[model samples]
Target: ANFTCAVASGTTCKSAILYTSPNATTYGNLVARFNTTTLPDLLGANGLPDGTLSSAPVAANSTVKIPFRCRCNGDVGQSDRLPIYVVQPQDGLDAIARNVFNAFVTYQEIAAANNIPDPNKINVSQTLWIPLPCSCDKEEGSNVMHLAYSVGKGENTSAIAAKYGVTESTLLTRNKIDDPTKLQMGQILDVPLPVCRSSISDTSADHNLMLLPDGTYGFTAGNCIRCSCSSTTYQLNCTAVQNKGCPSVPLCNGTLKLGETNGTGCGSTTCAYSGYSNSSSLIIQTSLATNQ
Candidate 1:
């Protein structure tokens, strides 16, 4: 039972109303002289999403959607004030995007760390933000900063923030995301870290698309055959394989490898033939390249 005290009127009136000896007692939803026009702020002033109500009643069973704002009272001129936003619910696709934004993303932190004249007023340059394939994540604790696994390695939000030389909370704010429990697997993310162009120089990158040939094999039992790129379909060769000195029209080496006399490779005592031609030994024109 909550309670409050206030002066009230009785059956008899007194001239000294301001300084009147009015009966005062604890109040628990009981009508006081201060009613309707006068209501107690049930919720304390300390701001939190829920716990108690502050100010007047705002109907029952209703909700309030507020723009995300978090500012901590720092020690004098030491701690900084930052802003964060909400991007999605944990179960949504944007969850990973939010994670990427939180994980590798930065701009706000840089501004605050450098003590920019106006951290929130600068025009951030238009940078390419690639949203990688999304991976599910679990909440690290009660916050957006999460503990996750990446590259077969266990990574926590704090650790990831440290890797980028930023504060864990800062990453969370820049991403405009709250609540870490909503992360999901295969969720695309918008990491703040810049994709190094140098990484692209590696010929083995997976994003390097490869368009392989689509030719039909007759499943010949024995005999080496010459195979060429099918001209019927126009396919990408971003990571295609090409060899200038392999079997082609002008240089088709239909050499059929047969019999123990032709070649005896890594053999047992008896030379037994499977009677099936192995296509693995067939050499073809191939090279790796970006989309051609």
Candidate 2:
């Protein structure tokens, strides 16, 4: 099936899918099963603390957002590279459709995407793609950002609309559902979520950094910058972290170093991670520090 990617392939966008685990598992299991993110990403997305156990128990049927880049490639929108699904013993194509991916896509759709000859037959350890739905279409005359969300079981249209602060009719009309009551679980919907904007230069590597107000963070700037977002101030807070593979991170304006604050009051300024160039030079913005 074709995903209408309105954004150009030349640019990028950030997105995450809300995934509900089918069984009682740990973060290790989630990392292994999804393979779309690292342990830190899982923690950062969930607002878990540093040094959290890789074996941390994630209760069954609980939801967590799996962050990944949404790319418009070959005239389609899907995850950039991974969040791949490995066939497990209990895995059935239809079951995988309903349970694993929040039923965002059907078994036939996944089978069609992966080029599998049979819908029902799949072997363990076989590689497969988790084709997630995404859209970059902005609501005209609004400062909203569109992200993907699959309707979950017991989730109807009105509840979902208010849950994300979207109007009931907008949600219905955007997805082209004739009536709110007819909405079903497992149908993917593109809803607009407010985003914290950044001032990173377009030429910078992470120019398209998109973050939500949810308590979460992202590792970018060649793994040297850990950027967190908050709803309170709607600002992206950045701090430097250790990076063994990349070059030394440069200081902000050649004065304050990355993550260091220059003031103590509301006038405080932080040497925030602006961007990176070739992993050799870093752009540290003297950002007006906001919510911590």
Candidate 3:
């Protein structure tokens, strides 16, 4: 619960919750329940294909990745409010922390984040924010995806590293861990994922965009753009999107329009989004970007 991570200089990484729904759930149901993220983003977190239907089934005891924009509170990185969990029958804060969240957090932490005067008095259907672990920085000197990992029984730093294709040093250094072989079950660790590189400009508001190459996606461009990082490309591939919020992209210049493609082959270029000027009031900046 006291875990803190240094936010890398000039980075605001997206982070996620490794959440499980012990009861039957659907993508649309989750979207309605979470009420903060979009369907596309929900799929992106799971590394599911972009076109997956909203009504798709999620079986009981299945885990889902709930993506959230990781922010640094002072020097500590965390997802302040996300993965809103509904209080289940006979569920206690301590049990919810250990059993539901797999010990990534503690009951005391949950009580603090939700401001519960009496942790013992939680009722069924009460909503609570599971403050999942995350970081807004690169680990091991590169852009990476971060996941909240709970150390399991019999697991060591090296075993967990090999399980996720990371190095023992990376885990130890990022988690500030000194003894790799003496980890306790339920100890939370910050794990960096080796996703594909991105071309989003450092000046862009979405500068921290990073995606799993296993077919996850993210939305930007004033909700008028959807980008993916699938293994087929191994690069950030963004396309035009249309939504209620400034659905149409403004032109970068007379010739280069937002999300428009030019040239072909390796020389291909697209007028990509840089960021919204002032974040609103509202103007968009675009530039020619080449996808690797």
Return the top candidate by TM-score. Answer: 2
Give candidate 3 regions above 4 Å deviation.
8-12, 85-90, 121-127, 151-165, 176-185, 209-214, 231-234, 242-270, 277-283, 290-292
Tens-place lDDT per residue, model 3, 1-292, is: 3446575533456876666676787998878765557887888767677689998788886777777766666566766577688998899999988776666677877888899988788989998987767776676577777877766578888788886668888788778876676788867778787676665676666677545634677777556667776667666666666556654565656676766778888889777656554444645556777856
Decreasing lDDT order of the candidates: 3, 2, 1
Report lDDT (Cα) of residue 188, candidate 1: 20
Could you estimate the TM-score for every candidate? 0.16, 0.79, 0.76
Per-residue lDDT tens digits of candidate 2, residues 136-231?
555554434455676767778788877766787667656767766756766778776665655456777776654554577777765677878776
TM-score of 2: 0.79
Q: Which ten residues in a row have the lowest lDDT in candidate 2?
A: 283-292
Candidate 2 yields a Cα-based lDDT of: 0.68
**Local lDDT at 163 for model 1:** 59
TM-score sort, best first: 2, 3, 1
Question: Which regions in candidate 1 have their CA more than 4 angstroms from the true location?
Answer: 1-100, 106-117, 123-292
- Whole-model lDDT, model 1: 0.23
Clashes of each: 22, 1, 1
The number of clashing residue pairs in model 2 is 1
- The deviation in Å at residue 82 for candidate 3 is 2.7
Worst 10 residues of 1 by lDDT: 11-20
